[PDB]
Amino acid sequence: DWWDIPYPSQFDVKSLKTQSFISVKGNKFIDDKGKTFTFRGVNIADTGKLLSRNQWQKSLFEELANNWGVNTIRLPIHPVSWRKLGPDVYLGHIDEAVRWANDLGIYLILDWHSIGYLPTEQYQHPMYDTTIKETRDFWRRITFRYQNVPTVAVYELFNEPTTMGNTLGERNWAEWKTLNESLIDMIYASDKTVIPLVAGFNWAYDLSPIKKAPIEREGIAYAAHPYPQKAKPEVKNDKNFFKLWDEKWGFAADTYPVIATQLGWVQPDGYGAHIPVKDDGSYGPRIVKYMQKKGVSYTVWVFDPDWSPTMINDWDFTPSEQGAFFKQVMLEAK
Amino acid sequence: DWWDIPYPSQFDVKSLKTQSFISVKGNKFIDDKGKTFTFRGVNIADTGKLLSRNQWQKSLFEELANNWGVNTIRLPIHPVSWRKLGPDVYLGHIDEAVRWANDLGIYLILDWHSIGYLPTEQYQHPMYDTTIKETRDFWRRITFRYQNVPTVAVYELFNEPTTMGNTLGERNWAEWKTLNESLIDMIYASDKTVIPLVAGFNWAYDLSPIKKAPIEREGIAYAAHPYPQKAKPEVKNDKNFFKLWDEKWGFAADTYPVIATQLGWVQPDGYGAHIPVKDDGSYGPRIVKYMQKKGVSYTVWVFDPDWSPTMINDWDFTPSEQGAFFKQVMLEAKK
Amino acid sequence: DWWDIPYPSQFDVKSLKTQSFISVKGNKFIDDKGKTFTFRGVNIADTGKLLSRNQWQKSLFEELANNWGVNTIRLPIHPVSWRKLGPDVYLGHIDEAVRWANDLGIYLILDWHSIGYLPTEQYQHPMYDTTIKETRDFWRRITFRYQNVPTVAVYELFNEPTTMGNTLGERNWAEWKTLNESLIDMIYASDKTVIPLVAGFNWAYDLSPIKKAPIEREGIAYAAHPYPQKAKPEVKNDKNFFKLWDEKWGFAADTYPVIATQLGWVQPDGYGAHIPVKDDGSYGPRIVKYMQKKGVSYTVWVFDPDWSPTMINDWDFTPSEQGAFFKQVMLEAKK
Numbered sequence A: 001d002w003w004d005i006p007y008p009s010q011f012d013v014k015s016l017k018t019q020s021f022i023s024v025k026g027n028k029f030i031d032d033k034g035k036t037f038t039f040r041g042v043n044i045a046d047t048g049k050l051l052s053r054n055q056w057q058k059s060l061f062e063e064l065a066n067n068w069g070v071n072t073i074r075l076p077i078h079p080v081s082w083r084k085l086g087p088d089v090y091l092g093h094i095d096e097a098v099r100w101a102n103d104l105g106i107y108l109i110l111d112w113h114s115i116g117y118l119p120t121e122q123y124q125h126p127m128y129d130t131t132i133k134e135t136r137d138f139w140r141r142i143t144f145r146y147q148n149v150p151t152v153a154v155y156e157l158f159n160e161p162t163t164m165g166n167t168l169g170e171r172n173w174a175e176w177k178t179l180n181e182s183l184i185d186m187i188y189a190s191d192k193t194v195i196p197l198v199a200g201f202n203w204a205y206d207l208s209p210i211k212k213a214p215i216e217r218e219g220i221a222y223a224a225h226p227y228p229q230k231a232k233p234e235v236k237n238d239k240n241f242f243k244l245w246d247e248k249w250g251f252a253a254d255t256y257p258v259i260a261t262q263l264g265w266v267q268p269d270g271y272g273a274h275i276p277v278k279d280d281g282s283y284g285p286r287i288v289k290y291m292q293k294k295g296v297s298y299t300v301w302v303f304d305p306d307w308s309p310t311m312i313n314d315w316d317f318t319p320s321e322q323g324a325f326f327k328q329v330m331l332e333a334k
Numbered sequence B, C: 001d002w003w004d005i006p007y008p009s010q011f012d013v014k015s016l017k018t019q020s021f022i023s024v025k026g027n028k029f030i031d032d033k034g035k036t037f038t039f040r041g042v043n044i045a046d047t048g049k050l051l052s053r054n055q056w057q058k059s060l061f062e063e064l065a066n067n068w069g070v071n072t073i074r075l076p077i078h079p080v081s082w083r084k085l086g087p088d089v090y091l092g093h094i095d096e097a098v099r100w101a102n103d104l105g106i107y108l109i110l111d112w113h114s115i116g117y118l119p120t121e122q123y124q125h126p127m128y129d130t131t132i133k134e135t136r137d138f139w140r141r142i143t144f145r146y147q148n149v150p151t152v153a154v155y156e157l158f159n160e161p162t163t164m165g166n167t168l169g170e171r172n173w174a175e176w177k178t179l180n181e182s183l184i185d186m187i188y189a190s191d192k193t194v195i196p197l198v199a200g201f202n203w204a205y206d207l208s209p210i211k212k213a214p215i216e217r218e219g220i221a222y223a224a225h226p227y228p229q230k231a232k233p234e235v236k237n238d239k240n241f242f243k244l245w246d247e248k249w250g251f252a253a254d255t256y257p258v259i260a261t262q263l264g265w266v267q268p269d270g271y272g273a274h275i276p277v278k279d280d281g282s283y284g285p286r287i288v289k290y291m292q293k294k295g296v297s298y299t300v301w302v303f304d305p306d307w308s309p310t311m312i313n314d315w316d317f318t319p320s321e322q323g324a325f326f327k328q329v330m331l332e333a334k335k
């Protein structure tokens, strides 16, 4: 009976091992000792996808923390999967991820993984289909359930804003800014210790509107998705890419913390190769060098053998080209 | 086939016995003889809840009218129930309530029983979940079906506006005012004889925004839900509560008709006790005295043995503490 | 698995026979040689309705093009049918219509066939029920699939705006204008060769708001639904109807292209007769004379034996009164 449906419960924070909160101070993330923190890690696939092949397990997290040097895992929660499993079930699985991550001393970025234009509720693909109401409700539920949980560090409000050349709507920064501020207000009303992560247009590549009209809230970080072909210099070299990246997203790191929550590549003739993830490999050192210089955090896309570009070729964790590259980088940084 | 789906019908007004319309005149409700009218009654549970236990029957209405002195029943129509039964079936059951009430000479308040912030479509619990579209459609259907039915006196547009400390959205009077005016306009387009009832924030407790920006429509009344702990004076007495109630909602009765569509209490250690319905009992005489002085109408929450705070302890209508208290008050007022 | 659902594909334009695009220039439609073009044709029923009785077939289009003189068919896509068949299946059937029409050298008007007020998402009947999100998605999908297809000439954004005497919402031209501009922008982003068709209030009858506040986009045309009883002169004659039609919709043809996407009549005591389609027959020559004089395009409602007013009495295409009349008119004009 509907009148017997219980009110929701909050995650039991006393079940967790000690773990520092991460907070925003100026243009940096810091831990509870004031030491500069950098999120360095990977995306995994949607929980529902992993469950379907029996790969949603602690052993996945252990492999990453122990053998790949990650301090962060990004969970891309697809709206279609949220609906298919249903909120109560999906949240129960996120609880498992919180416990596994906490046990390993690593952090989670929760990503509402849609692609398109939320103000008009039009999207790149139905797997990303959502509504303002559903998006608000997702964040209402998440914020309430994970109040005062250090393991869950970042709430990435909407993965990839895009109008696909204004076919989905008319991109308008003021309208998108206002909507992010509305989401932030709902979150901050319920938990002020979380870090909202806000994205610009062109699939979370273009942060340039924040130069004139930044989000008017404190404690936030900005996303960037600097895939190799987002910048298109006529001549491909460090100088030309750095200038282009500087103007579109890199500048943000001077004033706000930035997380490159998606990056990576595959050979142009490789598995699942498509624009804008095609590259000969020179991008890897280039993007790492740039991020290092700017102090930018990152989560590689994606630690999965099916979704591309892959970091692994199988569920024995055989590394792909980009996987082998980032594995060495992250292990050195740890 | 979808192209064969028939257009809706209206309630047959000729099936009803003679009953006066209630109308708004200034700060008062009046009957068709211009005599001041006060709604005095109770809430019952959602129709779907009552149906599930075979308690949706005329005998319920008869008990209330004959033995509890009510002239009004408030039906709190939960959106989840509206969806579960479906509009056509739910409306058929509301038709039954109209006939029963009309036969007894009593009135109905139809309440779109949601709790939360409609402009962002975020709510306290999924049982209240709705949308602006669904809310409009509810009032479109209701207004059409019950055109020119005196028995259905009041359309209470949205039970309890709240943002739950701005966790549901940013409370904003201007946007809420505009949305109520939109709903009123749809209703008045279809039936001008109905009384819309409009609520403020803090779970329909705070009417103070209407001092500066009242709804810009005539013929309306304002709701109040003055539960015992909504006002929180340091020292609990008549003087201190009256002052607080005056500033938040009582003042409205000087200019507009007011209906306290929810009120009541249970002991702090009693069944279903929670903030803000906890009280030692002194509230009962206090709220009745205040409403009497201001000429405020009321429907007690709730005449049900499960939902709290209860007016009855069972379906034999054994009165609870607050039930026994309000029963005597209403029976006296009916005289 | 949801992650394996493929991305959509576009119609194969190389499968089509040569056919001129139609474009807007000033107050006229023109072909690719700059010659003035007039859409002259009929509505058929919703694809889903036709499928249910096995009447969705090329032979329908052939009958119309060969024997009724049409150069245009309007497809009224009902939202309930779009949902029932589902977008992928419905689009597959529209692909059939594109091929059939193209093979015959005729054109299609795609009509999102709702009746009501999209800004509040309230409608005359559930078969028309939709949302802004669904309406946008329909046009997103259509525009992408039929990019660079000359056969599909017109995208009629929303069949019949009405608030039904403000029972559905408060009619507001600025709000409706803005929403049409938003739809136009999504379409033009994906295909600039299409012609959007925009409607006014009173069931797409009243274009008068465009005198002061026209849609601020180029390449658009305006719809009119001049059913016989939309204008109500005291004395029914050419002079009095022409004056009324001039003021409400005819004036638009002086500045913009106009398509009367619905028109027609049945005797007042005839099959499916209702306001505002009732007429003695004198309307037929009258509306044709008016349109001819103004250079207005048209699609008669409706070439179906069930939906009214009918152009045919059966699926052997036995003409009704209005069908016989318009058949002769269209056949002559095709010369």
Ligand SMILES: OC[C@H]1O[C@@H](O[C@@H]2[C@@H](O)[C@H](O[C@H]3[C@H](O)[C@@H](O)[C@H](O)O[C@@H]3CO)O[C@H](CO)[C@H]2O)[C@H](O)[C@@H](O)[C@@H]1O
Pocket (backbone or CB within 6 Å): A115, A159, A160, A203, A262, A272, A275, A276, A277, A306, A307, A308, A309, C003, C004
């Ligand atoms: O799902 C099986 C199917 O998956 C394809 O992988 C897709 C990924 O490539 C895709 O990654 C994209 C991100 O989701 C976006 O945020 C970003 O803009 O673009 C990324 C790619 O550049 O994610 C989806 C799920 O969201 C995956 O379906 C494989 O490429 C394909 O081989 C396989 O059949």
Ligand SMILES: OC[C@H]1O[C@@H](O[C@@H]2[C@@H](O)[C@H](O[C@H]3[C@H](O)[C@@H](O)[C@H](O)O[C@@H]3CO)O[C@H](CO)[C@H]2O)[C@H](O)[C@@H](O)[C@@H]1O
Pocket (backbone or CB within 6 Å): A003, A004, B115, B159, B160, B203, B262, B272, B277, B301, B306, B307, B308, B309
């Ligand atoms: O439903 C089963 C569950 O019911 C609980 O009763 C609830 C009522 O206490 C509740 O009353 C509230 C109103 O609905 C609100 O408008 C108002 O803000 O506060 C009232 C007092 O809380 O209504 C809900 C349904 O809307 C009832 O479910 C019982 O407390 C519980 O024991 C029982 O199992």
Ligand SMILES: OC[C@H]1O[C@@H](O[C@@H]2[C@@H](O)[C@H](O[C@H]3[C@H](O)[C@@H](O)[C@H](O)O[C@@H]3CO)O[C@H](CO)[C@H]2O)[C@H](O)[C@@H](O)[C@@H]1O
Pocket (backbone or CB within 6 Å): B003, B004, C115, C159, C160, C203, C262, C272, C274, C277, C306, C307, C308, C309
């Ligand atoms: O479908 C079965 C039922 O259909 C009725 O036909 C209806 C048509 O008359 C109706 O046409 C209207 C248009 O849809 C509107 O755009 C316009 O304002 O008015 C037209 C005529 O009044 O369309 C609906 C479907 O949209 C049809 O149902 C038959 O008249 C009836 O006998 C039959 O049982």
Ligand SMILES: [Cl-]
Pocket (backbone or CB within 6 Å): A161, A162, A163, A164, A165, A166, A171, A201, A202, A203
């Ligand atoms: Cl964009």
Ligand SMILES: [Cl-]
Pocket (backbone or CB within 6 Å): B161, B162, B163, B164, B165, B171, B201, B202, B203
């Ligand atoms: Cl509130």
Ligand SMILES: [Cl-]
Pocket (backbone or CB within 6 Å): C161, C162, C163, C164, C165, C171, C201, C202, C203
């Ligand atoms: Cl209208």
Ligand SMILES: [Mg+2]
Pocket (backbone or CB within 6 Å): A146, A148, A149, A150, A151, A152, A153, A154, A193, A194
């Ligand atoms: Mg946290």
Ligand SMILES: [Mg+2]
Pocket (backbone or CB within 6 Å): B146, B147, B148, B149, B150, B151, B152, B153, B154, B193, B194
């Ligand atoms: Mg009434």
Ligand SMILES: [Mg+2]
Pocket (backbone or CB within 6 Å): C146, C147, C148, C149, C150, C151, C152, C153, C154, C193, C194
């Ligand atoms: Mg075209």
